[PDB]
Amino acid sequence: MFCFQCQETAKNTGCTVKGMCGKPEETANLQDLLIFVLRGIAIYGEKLKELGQPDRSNDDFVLQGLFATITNANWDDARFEAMISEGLARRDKLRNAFLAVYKAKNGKDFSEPLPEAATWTGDSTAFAEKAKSVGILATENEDVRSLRELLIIGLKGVAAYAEHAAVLGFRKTEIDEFMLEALASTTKDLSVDEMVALVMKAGGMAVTTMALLDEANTTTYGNPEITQVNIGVGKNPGILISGHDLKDMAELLKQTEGTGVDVYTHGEMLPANYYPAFKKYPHFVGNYGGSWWQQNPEFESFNGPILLTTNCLVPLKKENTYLDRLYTTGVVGYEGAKHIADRPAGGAKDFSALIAQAKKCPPPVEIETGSIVGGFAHHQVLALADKVVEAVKSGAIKRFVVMAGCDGRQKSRSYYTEVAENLPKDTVILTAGCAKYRYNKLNLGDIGGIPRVLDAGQCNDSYSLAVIALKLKEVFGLDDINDLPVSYDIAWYEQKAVAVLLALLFLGVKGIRLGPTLPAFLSPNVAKVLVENFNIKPIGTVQDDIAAMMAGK
Numbered sequence: 001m002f003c004f005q006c007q008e009t010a011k012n013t014g015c016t017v018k019g020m021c022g023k024p025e026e027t028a029n030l031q032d033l034l035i036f037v038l039r040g041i042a043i044y045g046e047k048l049k050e051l052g053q054p055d056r057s058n059d060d061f062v063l064q065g066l067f068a069t070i071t072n073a074n075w076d077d078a079r080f081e082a083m084i085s086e087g088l089a090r091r092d093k094l095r096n097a098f099l100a101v102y103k104a105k106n107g108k109d110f111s112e113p114l115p116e117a118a119t120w121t122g123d124s125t126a127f128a129e130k131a132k133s134v135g136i137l138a139t140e141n142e143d144v145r146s147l148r149e150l151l152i153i154g155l156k157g158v159a160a161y162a163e164h165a166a167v168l169g170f171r172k173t174e175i176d177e178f179m180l181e182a183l184a185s186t187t188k189d190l191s192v193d194e195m196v197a198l199v200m201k202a203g204g205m206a207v208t209t210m211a212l213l214d215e216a217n218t219t220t221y222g223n224p225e226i227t228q229v230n231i232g233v234g235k236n237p238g239i240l241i242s243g244h245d246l247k248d249m250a251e252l253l254k255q256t257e258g259t260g261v262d263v264y265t266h267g268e269m270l271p272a273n274y275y276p277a278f279k280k281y282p283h284f285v286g287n288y289g290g291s292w293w294q295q296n297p298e299f300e301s302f303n304g305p306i307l308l309t310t311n312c313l314v315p316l317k318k319e320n321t322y323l324d325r326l327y328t329t330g331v332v333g334y335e336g337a338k339h340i341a342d343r344p345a346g347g348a349k350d351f352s353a354l355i356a357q358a359k360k361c362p363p364p365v366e367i368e369t370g371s372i373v374g375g376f377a378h379h380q381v382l383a384l385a386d387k388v389v390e391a392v393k394s395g396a397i398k399r400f401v402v403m404a405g406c407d408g409r410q411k412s413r414s415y416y417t418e419v420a421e422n423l424p425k426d427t428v429i430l431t432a433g434c435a436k437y438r439y440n441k442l443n444l445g446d447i448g449g450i451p452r453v454l455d456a457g458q459c460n461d462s463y464s465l466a467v468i469a470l471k472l473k474e475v476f477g478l479d480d481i482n483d484l485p486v487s488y489d490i491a492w493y494e495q496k497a498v499a500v501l502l503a504l505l506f507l508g509v510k511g512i513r514l515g516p517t518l519p520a521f522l523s524p525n526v527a528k529v530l531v532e533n534f535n536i537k538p539i540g541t542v543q544d545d546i547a548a549m550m551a552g553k
């Protein structure tokens with residue numbers, strides 16, 4: 001196999017036998033074959049748009065297919081085989097439509113050679129063998145490979161956010177059109193300038209999409225607000241909801257009300273605690289456990305059903321006993337785990353089986369007590385702008401350090417905990433995404449009532465951090481966003497974090513420290529372009545990076 005899309009890739013060059021995440025060769029290869037089919041859909045879908053007859057019937061299929069290939073999202077080979085077969089049928093429909101339109105417009109049959117993605121077909125028996133030859137290493141030129149894969153990796157992060165926006169009824173034609181433009185580009189021989197421009201256009205579409213999801217979430221569930229979240233447990237059985245999807249949360253809360261089954265969040269569902277629409281339910285206890293990578297012992301000790309709305313779902317250890325109470329939904333899949341089917345349009349998902357099962361389970365084992373404070377998304381922080389601005393002017397807050405991003409298992413990530421613990425006491429950490437778990441259970445206190453860790457929410461809520469920075473740029477009358485007293489020390493793991501990075505680069509942020517390692521998918525020449533254009537830096541020692549950041553460097 002070959003896969004190098006997450007921070008944990010083997011030797012920081014690429015997984016070749018079995019993924020460090022657990023992804024087997026067969027699964028990895030099927031994900032490659034799906035992306036190949038998506039490129040075929042894109043070839044025709046882009047041409048139909050160019051001919052003045054766009055077809056948007058595959059918008060949801062494309063978003064969900066990309067999302068299913070994100071790290072820790074879907075482990076069920078049958079789901080991939082089904083998507084590949086459906087994708088081939090969708091592609092052929094577009095092809096037939098295209099051939100007719102082309103003939104009408106040109107007075108002749110289409111006869112130009114096309115990439116194999118546009119024409120290859122087979123039944124499911126043929127998938128495993130074909131998959132071996134349509135992966136990443138089929139691009140021989142290392143720089144073209146780097147730029148094509150950087151594009152696809154950012155694109156699938158954008159697709160995840162777009163899917164959540166679509167679930168909530170929010171969509172923009174430019175997003176769906178760009179999915180096909182970007183996918184199709186990876187089958188064309190383009191100049192370096194053209195390939196880099198596509199990556200920067202993806203960063204701009206990440207801004208669009210992150211803004212759309214921010215709109216979708218807050219319009220539907222209210223603006224996040226300051227909230228104290230219990231991390232201890234109650235005395236009823238519970239259901240633990242993980243991942244990112246807030247519509248799934250809304251439905252789970254409604255369906256569990258009055259049943260005697262409590263609801264707890266996990267991981268990237270922690271920010272559901274911050275939304276007014278959800279805070280109104282007394283049986284919503286709080287947040288259980290830590291970061292995604294600790295889930296094997298924590299899902300075990302939770303004792304009740306676990307619902308995965310998105311990644312990250314980690315494979316079970318041999319000794320784990322919770323498969324029978326593990327539920328997947330949306331793009332998530334796992335062999336042997338019960339899947340909750342998509343809601344009908346205008347309707348809701350059916351979580352009744354989780355509720356019936358939870359009633360048969362013991363309450364969660366308490367693994368800690370206390371609380372987490374959060375809910376500092378853009379509306380809440382801008383509501384406190386006068387207070388924040390005065391603290392900056394008085395010197396009570398000397399600097400903000402953006403430590404948003406995504407966590408992982410490597411021990412080198414102790415760096416983030418140690419930076420948080422050793423930053424001077426007149427600094428404030430701004431966070432969003434599971435990177436927060438390296439420092440959100442410390443006792444850093446507050447500065448004049450402003451907590452020293454301000455959690456804006458999920459990784460998508462990095463959008464709020466950009467809104468806040470842009471507000472502060474305006475208040476302080478600065479010409480360049482980089483001249484604010486803000487440093488960026490971002491942790492990444494998977495593809496959504498890469499989309500957030502590209503959005504920040506599109507917004508003009510320079511000097512970002514990215515860690516705990518730099519992506520394997522940046523070739524030496526591409527890495528050099530990014531360094532020269534954007535001053536991206538690797539992490540150094542805790543002492544050196546704190547001293548540099550405090551100097552604004």
Ligand code: SF4
Nearest residue numbers: 003006015019020021
């Ligand atoms: S998702 Fe990450 S750990 Fe898993 S196979 Fe790909 S690069 Fe390796």
